[PDB]
Each structure stands twice: as C-alpha cells, then as structure tokens.
Amino acid sequence: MVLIPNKPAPEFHGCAVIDGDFKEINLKDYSGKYVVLFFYPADFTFVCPTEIIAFSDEVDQFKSRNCQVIACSTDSKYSHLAWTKQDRKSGGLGDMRIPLLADPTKSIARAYGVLDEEEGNAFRGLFIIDPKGILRQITVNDKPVGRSVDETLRLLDAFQFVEKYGE
Template identity: 40%
Template structure:
C-alpha cells in the first residue's frame, strides 16, 4: 500500500507527524510518496493540470499490475477505509479461487459467494440473499 500526492516528502513528514499520528496510532503504516511533477497522477487520470494537484483516487492493483478497482472523489468528499479493505478482501478471495467463486455486493469474508456459470444464469436472485 502506498500514498502518493504532489506534496513534497517534507509536507508528507509534517502531515504524518502533526495530523495522521493523532488520527492513527503511530501514523500511516505505509509509505507516502511524492509525485511532485504529477507524472503518476497523469497515468491514473487524477492529475488536475489547471491547479497542479492530484484529485483523490484510490486504486487497487493486483500482483500482475492490473487495476482491479478504483474510486475517484472530489476533495470535499471523505473516503471509507473499511470499504476499501472490503474490496481488497473480496478481490483476494476471487483471485484465490481462480474466479470459481465471486463475491456479491457487500460481501464480507465468511459470507456466501456466487459460483459463476450457466447454472447461475437467471438464478442470482435465488442464490444471493442481501443481508
């Protein structure tokens, strides 16, 4: 896991020490990287050329380098870290089963999964019970 922004490493250090360490015991447990020129933000489509900053984006990239999920929010809208972690767990489960099991909306570890195939067509409503 990485945090990347156009801010300098010095701004990241101050943010970690002054703010994040008070929100999360010990601060963020992963690196904060500087993308001062916006190159990474441009690649992922979150760099705003007009104001020279990255819009908030969350990307889940699998071990093969493929973006599996992303969310882009405007700065005034807060993110949900629990949902982000749920996405990761769901993607890990699907990867572990080789796609033989997929996770419906709101899936949590231990909840029922769906087994894709011709037997599921037209019967998702029978198999997937929302909680």
C-alpha cells in the first residue's frame, strides 16, 4: 500500500524454517532489534539462489549490527524447507543461516506492497525496520536485478549512527 518511512512497519507473523525446523515468527519477536525484511520471487531458480546465499554468508556482519535478517517469498513452508535440503551445487540453497518466512496466502507481500498481482509473486523488495518497529528504508527492484549486502550494511550503519547521535 502507502508505505512510508517514519511510520510503523506492517506487522507480520508466519511459519519460517530456521536451522531445519518450522518455528512461528512475529515481527514483535524482534522488538529491540533492527530487522531487514527482504522478499524474493519463485525458488529453486536457475539464477539467484546466489543472492540469498550472499546474505546468508555475511550473516556475521548483520549479527554484528544487532540486526535480524529475514527472507520471504510467496512459497509454502515445505518448499522452503526443501530448498535448504538441496545443496548449493545443484541450484539449491545449501546451509542457511537466515530464516525463510513462508507467505503462501500472499498477504505479507501485498501488505508490504511488493506483490506482482499479474504474476502472483513478489518483487525484489527490501525493508529496514527500527528496534521500535518503525519503517526506515524501502527498496524495490524490478525482478531481474538483485541487492547488495554492502549497501544494506551501509544503510544499517547510517540509521544506527543517527539513532545514537544525528549530525
């Protein structure tokens, strides 16, 4: 919808696969932490399992900034689980260090305004949310083009800097 920074981010709950298990997560569960919520389309893709792997591999950098990264797509909780079990060599996902939140009702994606209604999957949206649950950053790419880990870290730094100071 009309998503705007400096307003409370739309709340979301759902089943996410974490370390090979189904756990229910809620945006409120991360109160006190920064949250990067990023959506992707399809799954076991011939290109770009790599983008998700990219963020997973640098998960250390996000834990460092007191930030929880959450990946999300319009697939079922079971599809996600399958992607983890598939190794990286096959077009799979290998080991995952960040939660895959499943959005099969498409409601979370439509809530963050990133749903391609014509095709039924999400755009490449990225959202940064405050420890108080306030939206700080909105990024949406056309489907072919992916996201930088460095850019997300740069933004996280800027926001956390302003949070401590402001100049």
